[PDB]
Each structure stands twice: as C-alpha cells, then as structure tokens.
Nucleic acid binder design. Structure first.
Lengths: 50, 237, 100
DNA sequence: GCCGTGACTAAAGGCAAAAAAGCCTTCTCGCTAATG
RNA sequence: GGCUUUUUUG
DNA sequence: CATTAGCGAGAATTTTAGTCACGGC
C-alpha cells in the first residue's frame, strides 16, 4: 500500500518471501559452480531456518 | 606431506581397479596382458598380476579413464549390494531377524544355496516356516549364481577389492576435506582487494587440489594465481 | 498462484514440531535427533548395508569418518532434508503396517 | 525392566468502541545540488 | 490503510 | 570559482496438559 510521499509501506510477508528467494537464488548460483562443501552446509542450514 | 597420502590412496584404488600415440603406453600393458591369462588360468599368478598391474600405473594417461574403470567396477558391487538388500528385505524385514546370523550363514555360503536350508537347523521360528520366502530367497540366487559366473571373480575378493578401493577413495577425500577448510583466511585476505569474497574461494579448492609436493612456489602465492584470476577478468562477470 | 523452485529439498516444520511429531512416530526416533539431522550438524546413516551399522542410526563427524575410512561406499549416509526424503521414500507402508 | 516419577515444554488469558501519536532493513558512490 | 504504542467509555 | 554532501538506485505470571528421560522394587 502506498502512503504519502515516495515511500511504500511494506508488509511482513513480502520481506520474508524476499529473504527466502534471495537465499534460494544465492544457493542455486553457488551450487552451479561446485563450491566447497563447507559453504553449502551453512547456506542450506540458513535456508532451512529462513 | 599431506599430498603423499592422497597419492597413496590413488595407488591403492589403481591396484583395486587393475586387479600408436595411445598404443606405446598400452604396449607395456599388453607385454603381459595375454601372458597372464594362462598363468592365472590354473603363487606365480599373484607374482605376475603384480607386474601386470604395476605397469598400468607407471604412466598416467587421463584421470577420466580411471573414473571410467571405477564406475565399470562399481556397477558390479552395485548389483551385488542390490542382491544383498533384496535378500535382506525378504528375510529380516517380514521376519524378526537379528541380522547377525548372515555373518555365519550368508558370508560363508554365497554361491552355496544351502545357507537358507541351514536356517531351519538353528531354530528361528520365522526361519522354521521359511516356505514361501525360501523359494523367494533362492529364486533371486538363480540370478546371483550366473552374475558371479559372468563376473568371473570370487565374491569374497569382490568385497575385498571394493573395501580397499573405498578405503583409498575415503582417505583421499578425507585428506582433501581436512586440509581445505584451513585455507580460508588467505582467501579472505586476497579477496579483500560478499560475492567477490565467495568467488575468492571458488578457486581455492582448485588451487588446493592442484598443489603438489613436487611444487615449491609458496602455496599462498601458488593459489594467488587462481584467486587473482577471479579479479583478472571475471570480476565484472 | 505462485511457486518457488527450492534449490534442494527442505523439510516442513509443522509435521515435525507438533505435540506429537508425525515424522517422529512414523520413523520412531526421538525429536531431538531429527532436528540435528536436518541442521546438518549431526551425521546420520540411511542404509547400513552389510556393515555393522544400523540403517536408522545417528552418528557424528568422527564416527562417520572413522566408518568412512573403514567401509565407505559399502554403507550409504546422506544429510538433511534430502536424506530424510530418501529414507521416507525407501520406507514402505503396508509392510510396516503388517509388522505392527 | 516396566510403570512411577519428576522434569521440561506448548498454549491461552473479553467484549465492543473511541482519541491520539509514530513506522515500512542498512551501506555506498557519481553528477546534481548544497556549501564555502 | 496495515502495524505498533498509549489514553478513555461502558 | 572552487569544494563537497548526497541519495537513487543498487546491493548484502498463572494455570493446565502433554511428553520424555531417569529410576525404583
């Protein structure tokens, strides 16, 4: 919903969805290049948390 | 020093596997490849397969060929394990077995279709009434026998070969994963020159697994090449 | 409706963390071990095979690597929601029903 | 060795109305505007 | 127009 | 006339019920 001025009011759901999609895309790009397994563990765990 | 253990594991896996331009090296293989067949067709069998397997390791052509041989011998153990798990789901699953008896029963019989017959001898009321599953047990054996025959090598030696090649691969991967994780501080320091930080360590594994003991340019500086390769052209990628 | 393709399988929370755990009772392990398995900080085997490891046994880093150098490819062990999905898919239903 | 036991944890706690306020991540730089 | 925080009526 | 922020756009307590681990004869 747009309030007065250039700012746009944000809802909680959009922020969480943005976080999840950002982490998913990061893990996708990082996995395509066969990154070391230590990194992918932390990324997978944090995606689980998200 | 750590790379020496990796090379030893590679040698062990090579021993397990082996148990004109591309023909000059193959000449060393074929100098006794046909000479070993009659000697092992009957001591000297081991003595000469040692020489047959050692020349294959003298010159390394392509690691992809080694991987090809690895999966070629892996499909055999894969179907052996498939038969094992099929027998397990026949017996232990629908029965209430402790699964310990197969060390006494299955591991000593293999081709012998008598271990399931002997299961009645030691009680096991579930094995007392094998009946339908007994037919269901040894009917899959009528696959295992000709599988073993077409393999041409004994089951116990198959398991031993798989164990030693697995030991070699496990040691190699253990060394790799136990000395890659300690090389992150240098990656951070060089990448400071977060996506850039991660592309600093994407080449870390390459420069680490490429580092040999016949080298002697500093491993930090030896990796500098590949971490700066990320900054060289792919920084804008 | 919109859909997002997860980079890897990911486990649901509700069926895990109700007062009775659905997956916990289906698989018959305590709730504590399942969360550790999902969070990748505790190694777990999914198929012991011919070795001396239970199919549904919980391990750790040192135990797994020690078993890895002893057996390795003989036994199969994977982590996380991927392993959980694999062991669910490998576990049939009607046979367990008749066993119970 | 199984039921008793205690220790640990999830879940809800009134209805409607009004009146106010104040917010919706934070770090970084090139040409435009703020500044001297 | 959502949330948060107060104050008030019954 | 000369110097510099800057932001636009982008990016990184009470009460109750239930369950689970220890333990007691």
């Amino acid at each position: 919903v747009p309030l007065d001025g250039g700012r746009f009011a944000t809802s909680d759901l959009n922020d969480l969805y943005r976080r999840v999609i950002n982490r998913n895309n990061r893990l996708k790009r990082l996995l395509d290049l066969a990154a070391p397994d230590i990194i992918v563990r932390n990324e997978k765990r944090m995606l689980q948390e998200a | 020093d750590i790379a020496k253990r990796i090379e030893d594991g590679i040698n062990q896996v090579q021993c397990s596997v082996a148990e004109e331009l591309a023909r000059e090296k193959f000449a060393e293989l074929r100098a006794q490849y046909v000479v070993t067949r009659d000697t092992i067709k009957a001591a000297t069998a081991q003595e000469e397969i040692l020489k047959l397997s050692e020349v294959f390791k003298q010159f390394r052509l392509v690691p992809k060929q080694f991987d090809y041989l690895v999966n070629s011998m892996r499909v055999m153990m894969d179907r052996v394990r498939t038969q094992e798990r099929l027998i397990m789901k026949l017996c232990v699953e629908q029965c209430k077995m402790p699964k310990k008896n197969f060390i006494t029963l299955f591991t000593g019989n293999e081709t012998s279709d008598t271990w399931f017959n002997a299961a009645i001898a030691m009680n096991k009321p579930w094995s007392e009434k094998l009946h339908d599953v007994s037919e269901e047990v040894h009917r899959a054996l009528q696959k295992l026998q000709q599988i073993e025959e077409e393999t041409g090598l004994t089951i116990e030696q198959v398991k031993d070969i798989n164990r030693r090649m697995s030991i070699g691969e496990a040691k190699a991967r253990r060394a790799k994963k136990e000395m890659v994780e300690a090389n992150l501080r240098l990656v951070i320091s060089i990448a400071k020159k977060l996506d850039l930080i991660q592309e600093g360590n994407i080449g870390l594994m390459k420069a680490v697994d490429k580092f040999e003991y016949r080298r002697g340019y500093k491993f930090s500086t030896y990796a500098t090449w590949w971490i700066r390769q990320a900054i060289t052209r792919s920084i804008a990628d | 409706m919109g859909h997002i393709e997860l980079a890897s399988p990911t486990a649901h929370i509700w069926f895990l963390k109700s007062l009775p755990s659905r997956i916990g009772l289906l698989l018959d392990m305590p709730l504590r071990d399942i969360e550790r398995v999902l969070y990748f900080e505790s190694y777990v085997v999914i198929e012991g095979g011919m070795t001396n490891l239970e199919r549904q046994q919980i391990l750790t880093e040192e135990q797994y690597l020690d078993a890895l150098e002893e057996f390795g490819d003989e036994f199969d062990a994977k982590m996380g929601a991927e392993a959980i999905q694999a062991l669910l898919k490998s576990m049939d239903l009607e046979q367990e029903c008749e066993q119970l």
